[PDB]
Ligand binder design. Sequence first.
Ligand SMILES: N[C@@H](Cc1ccccc1)C(=O)O
Ligand SMILES: [Ba+2]
Ligand SMILES: [Ba+2]
Ligand SMILES: [Ba+2]
Ligand SMILES: [Ba+2]
Length: 362
Amino acid sequence: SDLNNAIQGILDDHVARGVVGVSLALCLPGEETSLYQSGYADKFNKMPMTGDHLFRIASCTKSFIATGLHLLVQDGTVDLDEPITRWFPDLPKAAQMPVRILLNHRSGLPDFETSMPMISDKSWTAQEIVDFSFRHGVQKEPWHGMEYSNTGYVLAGMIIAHETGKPYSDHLRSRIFAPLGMKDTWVGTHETFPIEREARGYMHAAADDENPQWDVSGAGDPVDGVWDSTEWFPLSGANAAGDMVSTPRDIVKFLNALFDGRILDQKRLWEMKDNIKPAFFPGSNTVANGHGLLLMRYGSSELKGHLGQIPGHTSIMGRDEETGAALMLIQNSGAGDFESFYLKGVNEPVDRVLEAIKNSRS
Ligand SMILES: N[C@@H](Cc1ccccc1)C(=O)O
Ligand SMILES: [Ba+2]
Ligand SMILES: [Ba+2]
Ligand SMILES: [Ba+2]
Ligand SMILES: [Ba+2]
């Protein structure tokens, strides 16, 4: 179709801007999921990007962790409004933190990401990350305002572990991946995924990478303007805040089932996508968030989903609630600065795709 050529062109043009490669899973109303790729999964071996290449989806992990927690609220063992002192009695301010505050980025919890070395071989535990956050981060008052929190989801992950007697991956696998037949999806803290299948991730030496968000000391020298950042950071360091590996195809399966009421009951789905307040994420299109989903605005269209940034893999997932269109776009190019083209520019082909869908629909 014409939409097919228009979408493929949008991807080609984005790769031609300097992006190494891009993989898209798009699902439209009345149609099967269609996959598109452009550019490379491996820059130096010139291996074409396929719809089978795996990516680190970074904080899109957070939508699955929120889902995991909402499922436990349904099981009846967790209450969104109960104080987390039940699980973390000695966590400062825990009494002023209901369970939901872990999911909505208004907890005021000290964060770890800006302090955590991206280049290491260090294995992390959940508690260790929490300790590291209170050591190096700044705590604000619960409900102070919106400030993106990774710590919140590490704590959510620990509630899941406590309430299920097992790693959070087992709960996510048994309750989300298996039922949906998501065969190309792993939780990197607790599970081994096959690296040979993973698209390589590239960090760009770029002029607009002025204020890097990560400690990337020890990168060594760039080859051909890039670093192969794929195995820089051990996923245990992101834990429940961003440790998942998946394909666009697998992600779009999840989005469809979530929004089609096939995972969470109506009330918990509503908590996730509809019980919203204003939200900000630097460089992004984010305008609001619920309890596990960001609302991201693209002109006259909006995605309910998430963004992901982990060295070299830059992802956008979401459902457009108006048209029923679901998507996951992941490029294997990135940088450190939130406002760098290689990070914030991922929003450009997403914007263009949504206006191409909209144009074929008029
Ligand atoms: N902050 C990243 C996820 C992440 C958390 C912690 C460490 C590394 C990566 C994101 O929003 O996608
Ligand atoms: Ba600087
Ligand atoms: Ba390493
Ligand atoms: Ba509109
Ligand atoms: Ba038209």
